[PDB]
Design a protein around this ligand. Structure first.
Ligand SMILES: CC(=O)SCCNC(=O)CCNC(=O)[C@H](O)C(C)(C)COP(=O)(O)OP(=O)(O)OC[C@H]1O[C@@H](n2cnc3c(N)ncnc32)[C@H](O)[C@@H]1OP(=O)(O)O
Ligand SMILES: [Ca+2]
Ligand SMILES: [Ca+2]
Ligand SMILES: [Ca+2]
Ligand SMILES: [Ca+2]
Ligand SMILES: [Cl-]
Lengths: 165, 163
């Protein structure tokens, strides 16, 4: 069965989450640094998420985690406390099949429940999948910061999208 | 005669008072809680260790404003991008202090090989927006209702200048 179970992340999910995360760093422009992490790193990340009351959702298919989404602080200090910047990652062999849409729709509902006012996505301008994903859930384009990032001697642009809850 | 120079430890009390005045009273900084001197001490020390300038404008021997920049975002991908702030003392407003600080800070940024400067401005602040525009900043876009202060929502406009 391809049907997904959507639920909160447990420590048992960490190896899956680690592999999805490291693959996204190394192979995509989803994260603008090249830093690979380890299991202990993600363990701390998860603990700090739970402690801070930020959710981490996973999509599970045939017993295997095939994607996850979370959000955290957009910018430091009180002024921005009701704005959160989100993350979503689908396993590299499972993309284009609606897992992303499912995870984002649910994360949006969690954020509403937890009184988030604005969800923010910072997206590389050429990330067509992410742009389509967010547009499908009612995110609107705010604008683009040109050449603010860099890969491999190549300047990247950052598009912001937002959804007021 | 405004003198523009690098900040010292001696300047921290004046820097603290201008920073806390903005926090306490205006929409220019979206923190609510004031900071202490040790906090500004650590801030300045990290600025200097990281090679990010802190410039002060001095007139008749007193600090009447300052400007600095720092990381726009944490990811090393953004290392060549810096977000800047310019602060003028409220009793010293309207005399070219903002324009002069911003101009020298731009020179310091090129000198240090910054690629892009970013300003995050409260979107209704037409004066701050004009000031940045007059030095070649272009509007990127507005994040609506992303801030809150004093019981109201605030919109953040990003402007940029590629150096
Ligand atoms: C929020 C940020 O910080 S941006 C970073 C986002 N995350 C990443 O980039 C990590 C790497 N990529 C991924 O993990 C995934 O590609 C995601 C999360 C972006 C999308 O998840 P998926 O499960 O592939 O998305 P899903 O199948 O639900 O499709 C989402 C939309 O993107 C479109 N799409 C999916 N993949 C692609 C692609 N490779 N090229 C073009 N369009 C695509 C779909 O057609 C769909 O559009 P529609 O709603 O208009 O029909
Ligand atoms: Ca380790
Ligand atoms: Ca719910
Ligand atoms: Ca007060
Ligand atoms: Ca600002
Ligand atoms: Cl940001």
């Amino acid at each position: 069965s391809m049907t997904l179970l959507i639920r909160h992340a447990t420590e048992a999910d960490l190896p899956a989450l680690l592999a999805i995360y490291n693959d996204a760093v190394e192979n995509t422009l989803a994260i603008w640094n090249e830093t690979l992490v380890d299991l202990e790193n993600r363990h701390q990340w998860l603990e700090n998420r739970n402690r801070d009351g930020f959710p981490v959702l996973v999509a599970e298919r045939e017993g295997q985690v095939v994607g996850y989404a979370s959000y955290g602080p957009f910018r430091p200090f009180e002024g921005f406390r009701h704005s959160s910047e989100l993350s979503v990652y689908v396993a590299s062999n499972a993309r284009g099949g609606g897992i992303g849409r499912t995870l984002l729709a649910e994360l949006i509902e969690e954020a509403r429940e937890r009184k988030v006012h604005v969800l923010i996505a910072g997206i590389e301008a050429g990330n067509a999948a992410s742009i389509a994903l967010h547009r499908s859930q009612g995110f609107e384009e705010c604008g683009t910061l040109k050449q603010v990032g860099q890969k491999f001697g190549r300047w990247l642009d950052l598009l912001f999208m937002q959804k007021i809850l």
